[PDB]
Each structure stands twice: as C-alpha cells, then as structure tokens.
Amino acid sequence: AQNITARIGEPLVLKCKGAPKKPPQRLEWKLNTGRTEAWKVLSPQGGGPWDSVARVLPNGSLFLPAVGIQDEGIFRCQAMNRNGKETKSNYRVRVYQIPGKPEIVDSASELTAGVPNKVGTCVSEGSYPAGTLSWHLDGKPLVPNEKGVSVKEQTRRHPETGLFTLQSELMVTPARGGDPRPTFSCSFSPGLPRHRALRTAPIQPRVWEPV
C-alpha cells in the first residue's frame, strides 16, 4: 500500500491504475475506514448515502469532496483492462489538521530560585493527530525528571470534531546564581512532518533571590 496524506476538509482523488479512461468500466473500489462498518464496495454507478461521501468518477478514480478523520484507512481498487488484463491499487490514507498557534496561560510574572515554580501552561487546540508539546529554555529544550524540571501534561479530544486539545504545565527549580532573566517557550510538533513546528510567544519572568 502507498501512503497518502490529505488535509482535513480538502478534496481527495484516488487514481485507479489500469482502468479505462472512459465509461463503461469493469472496476470496484473496496475501502475500510471509520465510516465503513467493515469492507464497503463502491461501484462505478454507486447509489446511496455514499454518493455524497465517496464517488467513483467516469474515469474510474475515487473522489472524496472533503476528507475527514472518519475517512482514514485502506483504499483498494481492482480494475479490469479490456481483457482479461487486471490491475490492483492499494492506498493507505492518513489525514491531518493544524492547530491554532499555541498559547501560554497561568504564566509566572516572577519566580524564586532554589524552589519549584509554576512557569506556565501551554495550550494547543484543534490538532489532528494529537501531537506533542515541548518547552524550551533560551532556545534549548527542557527535559523532564532532570534537575527539578517536570511537566503536567494532558490530552483531550473534542466530542464532535474529534480534534485534540493539548495542555502542558511547566515547573522548574531554578539554580541559585543562574540566569535572572531566562526565556521560556512552548512548541507544538505534529505527528507526521506535514508542517513545521509551532512556537508560542516567549515568557520572560524575573528570577528573584530568596532571603
């Protein structure tokens, strides 16, 4: 199977290899996605509730007006070139969605060296697939469980759109004598490299010293 990646809401056309360019054609599409209860067979004539979802074109290609999460899966076409030449087509479809620009909430105006502090919470909404959030300190990435650095992550899927909302709360134990004016930032990285990482506006808290 060849891997195909389409953006949610965008149209998708799957070619039927070895199919006659004009009707009538001897072919059948069989797909297994989130819409199909099992294997759904689509004929050149079609006819049903699938016509507004997935339709076979006059040239034999499968057409989806607007792909969705429900349309992820396997698409296979078995065509018959006149005779008895037969050609198979195998497609693996994955979809994606870019979230809005990540925002930092509950950010600390100031913080104290030597003790755990709540730096802030990064929030990303409307992404598929889920993806990951990652914090950065002055350009370099921060890693959990190392030197008082910890995160409190959670992922939540919207009941209707099926899109994901990410939340990452950063906590750091600043080194005494360290940088009094550190720069923090959160970045969103998608599952597949379909686009570049999305980074928050930086937060620049003050580091005060304990009495």
- Closest alpha carbon to 8 in 163, 167, 188: 163
Q: For residue 172, give the nearest of 114, 133, 103 by alpha carbon.
A: 114
Decide: helix, strand or coil at residue 109: coil
For residue 106, CA distances in Å to 64, 109, 123, 168, 209 come to: 42, 9, 10, 11, 21
182: Cα separation from own chain's centroid: 31
Cβ–Cβ contacts within 10 Å for residue 79, how many?
20
Which of 98, 115, 141 is a domain's end point? 98
Secondary structure class of 124 (helix, strand, coil): strand
- 194 alpha carbon, distance to own chain's centre: 9
* 3-state DSSP assignment of residue 128: strand
Residues comprising the chain, all counted: 211
CATH of residue 12: 2.60.40.10
The verdict on 65 and 140 lying in the same domain is: no
Q: How many domains does the chain have?
A: 2
Position 117, amino acid: N
Q: Is the dihedral of CA 198, 189, 35, 66 positive or negative?
A: positive
Q: Which two tokens stand for residue 197?
A: 């990482």
Q: How far apart are CA 45 and CA 208, in angstroms?
A: 73
How far lies 82's CA from each of 44, 61, 85, in Å? 16, 17, 6
For 162, half-sphere exposure in the C-beta direction (CA atoms, 13 angstrom radius) is: 12
Range of the domain at 123: 99-211
Q: DSSP assignment, residue 211? A: -
Q: Are residues 94 and 117 in the same domain?
A: no
Name the pairing type of β-strands 110-112 and 150-157. Answer: unpaired
Quote the longest CA-to-CA distance of the chain.
Answer: 89
Minimal CA–CA distance to 104: which of 205, 207, 204, 203? 203
Residue 84 sits in the same domain as residue 55? yes
Quote the DSSP letter at residue 18.
T
Are residue 78 and residue 171 in the same domain, yes or no? no
Judge contact between 207 and 178, C-beta under 8 A.
yes
Q: Which residues pair with 198 in a beta bridge?
A: 188
First to last CA, the chain: 65
32 and 128, same domain (yes or no): no
**Tally of CB atoms within 10 A around 138:** 11
**How far is residue 72's CA from residue 93's CA, in Å, rounded to a whole number?**
5
Return the structure tokens found at 189. 């990285």
Tell me 97's DSSP state: B
Q: DSSP 3-state assignment of 25? A: coil
Please check whether residue 188 is in contact with residue 197, taking contact to mean a CB–CB distance below 8 angstroms: yes
Query: Does residue 108 share a domain with residue 94?
Result: no
Q: Looking at the structure, do residues 168 and 125 belong to the same domain, yes or no?
A: yes
The rounded distance, in Å, linking the Cα atoms of 15 and 57 is: 10
**Looking at the structure, do residues 48 and 113 belong to the same domain, yes or no?**
no
Say yes or no: 158 and 92 in one domain.
Answer: no
What are 104's two structure tokens? 């930092």
Same domain for 193 and 141: yes
Tell which phi-psi region holds residue 47, choosing left (phi > 0), alpha (psi between -120 and 50) or beta: left
Rounded Cα distance, 198 and 180, in Å: 26
**What are the structure tokens assigned to 194, written together?**
């379909």
Same domain, residue pair 193 and 110: yes
Q: What strand order describes the sheet that includes 85-96?
A: 2-7, 85-96, 73-81, 26-32, 40-42
Are residues 67 and 3 located together in one domain of the fold?
yes
**Can you list the positions of beta strands (E) in 12-131?**
12-14, 26-32, 40-42, 55-56, 62-64, 73-81, 85-96, 103-105, 110-112, 117-127
- Residue identified by tokens 């600390």 is 108
